[PDB]
């Protein structure tokens, strides 16, 4: 624990400074330290935790994709110029990406999910759980991949059940969850029909109860609603 001796409030402050400086590794490290104090996170703090790790793993995924693309052109008829280098470096990125996902899922399992009381917060962490299993799924293989897919679905599905029961259809976390579960269906579980179905339903039910938009978060809600519509444009 490199953050064990620092005040919780100071860690939260430095996370925000790191965000402004676009130092997402540092930001993740500070928020990890804050979580390990053992207190629940406020809404604001949960968003910082998510933004930090989302950007870290996002950079790794992006790098993975670049290397994967390069590797496709190589090891091919016509482009006979192989060598182990591309694979090796891609596997290096892969291992680090797995390391970060495991860290996040570790924090969630110990100790954000069980300590959550609010229904909004429980869904938030279950959505996160689904997301970081999804990211593991994108680079996994074999029996490992199968276990990961099941864990992602199970986390997403429980999140959905709670969100349908406890949250209005325009709630940004509910919308964000359905959006990403939709992506899971399309990109991981190989179920594009269910991806389209969920995305559409979510959008239409948000529109049907647009009056439920919150003054505090309608910008988030409308943005996710647009993202749903954009994915539907691509997928159909």
């Amino acid at each position: 624990g490199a953050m064990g001796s620092m005040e919780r409030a100071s860690l939260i402050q430095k996370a925000k400074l790191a965000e402004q400086a676009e130092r997402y590794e540092d930001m993740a490290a500070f928020m990890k330290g804050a979580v390990e104090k053992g207190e629940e996170l406020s809404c604001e703090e949960r968003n910082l935790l998510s933004v930090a790790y989302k950007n870290v793993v996002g950079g790794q995924r992006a790098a993975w994709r670049v290397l994967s693309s390069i590797e496709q052109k190589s090891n091919e008829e016509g482009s006979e110029e192989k060598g182990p280098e591309v694979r090796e470096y891609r596997e290096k990125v892969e291992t680090e990406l797995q390391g970060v996902c495991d860290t996040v899922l570790g924090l969630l399992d110990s100790h954000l999910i069980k300590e959550a009381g609010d229904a909004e917060s429980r869904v938030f962490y279950l959505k996160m759980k689904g997301d970081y299993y999804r990211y593991l799924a994108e680079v996994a293989t074999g029996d490992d991949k199968k276990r990961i897919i099941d864990s992602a679905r199970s986390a997403y599905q429980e999140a959905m059940d709670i969100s349908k029961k406890e949250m209005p259809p325009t709630n940004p976390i509910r919308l964000g969850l359905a959006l990403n579960f939709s992506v899971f269906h399309y990109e991981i579980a190989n179920s594009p029909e269910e991806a389209i179905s969920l995305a559409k339903t979510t959008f239409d039910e948000a529109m049907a109860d647009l009056h439920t938009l919150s003054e505090d978060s309608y910008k988030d809600s409308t943005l996710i609603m647009q993202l749903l519509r954009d994915n539907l444009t691509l997928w159909t």
Binding site: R65, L223, N231, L234
Partner: peptide, 18 residues
């Protein structure tokens, strides 16, 4: 917003293409 939207579309498109 349109920047976030563009990024999203490109990321989501990557899967479809590759």
């Amino acid at each position: 917003r349109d920047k976030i939207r563009l990024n999203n579309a490109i990321w989501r498109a990557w899967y479809i293409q590759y």
